[PDB]
Write a protein that binds this ligand. Structure first.
Ligand code: 6DS
Length: 250
């Protein structure tokens, strides 16, 4: 059975598409405002040297901080998000931050060379740049696998925006108070996505593959938090981060 998208569901898709267009800049025109990328010689992938310099940390912390501001902006426009208490809105935003960043970064990701290309060579990021910000292979290698797997789903913008919205509005986050309200908003989004796939995505299991990407994001989020914990033990690391990054990941 292929039920047609309701007027409410079409409205939700239009709102989410407009939300994304207002919060995502595909020209990466603000990148020159971040602290500059610094790429020291590190062919060996030396942990000692990486922690000593953290050369890419001010630039990547600014990029993530910027991306979180856009995610906050996006989330505010999700149908129903504003019906939640401000305590739940912040729990949802904090717990999902790195996952939604991983999803939205897929738009700039390219399988041509397995990089995140955000304009010129200065804003072209690879595995070696994430290690230069103090992260390790236990995070970057499944992260690249996730980017390729997600890129290969060839999501329509409609599916991409619904996936981000479903990620954010998740009832199974620690500290939520009204799980039932969060679940009702998420189901409204999940049903819109299933119906959209069935009636708009041409052949050649896409909904189940998208839900699997959400479970993959959970493991990546746990690895990132463990790595952020280690990176934060580096003396004077806080000056290389941002107040927003410190609060979200602290
Ligand atoms: C460079 C690769 C990557 C990939 C997800 C990234 C970058 C940083 C970090 C960690 C950083 C940290 O742990 C710190 F401490 F190492 F900095 C912390 F999370 F704490 F910040 C990780 C783990 C991965 C990245 C690439 C492009 C990105 O965006 C392109 C476009 O989406 C932007 C405009 C918009 O989203 O509206 C973003 C947002 C991130």
């Amino acid at each position: 059975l292929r039920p047609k998208l309701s007027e409410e569901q079409q409205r939700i898709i239009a709102i989410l598409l407009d939300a994304h267009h207002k919060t995502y800049d595909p020209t990466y025109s603000d990148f020159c405002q971040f602290r500059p990328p610094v790429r020291v010689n590190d062919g060996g992938g030396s942990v000692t040297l990486e922690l000593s310099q953290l050369s890419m940390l001010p630039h990547l912390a600014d990029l993530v901080s910027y991306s979180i501001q856009k995610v906050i902006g996006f989330a505010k426009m999700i149908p129903g998000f504003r019906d939640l208490t401000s305590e739940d809105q912040i729990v949802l935003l904090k717990s999902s931050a790195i996952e939604v960043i991983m999803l939205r970064s897929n738009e700039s990701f390219t399988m041509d060379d397995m990089s995140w290309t955000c304009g010129n060579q200065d804003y072209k990021y690879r595995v070696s740049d994430v290690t230069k910000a103090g992260h390790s292979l236990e995070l970057i290698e499944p992260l690249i696998k996730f980017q390729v797997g997600l890129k290969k789903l060839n999501l329509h913008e409609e599916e991409h925006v619904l996936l981000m919205a479903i990620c954010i509005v998740s009832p199974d986050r620690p500290g939520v108070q009204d799980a039932a309200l969060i679940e009702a908003i998420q189901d409204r989004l999940s049903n819109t996505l299933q119906t959209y796939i069935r009636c708009r995505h041409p052949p050649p299991l896409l909904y189940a593959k998208m839900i699997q990407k959400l479970a993959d994001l959970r493991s990546l989020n746990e690895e990132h938090s463990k790595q952020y914990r280690c990176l934060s033990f580096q003396p004077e690391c806080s000056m290389k981060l941002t107040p927003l990054v410190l609060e979200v990941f602290g």
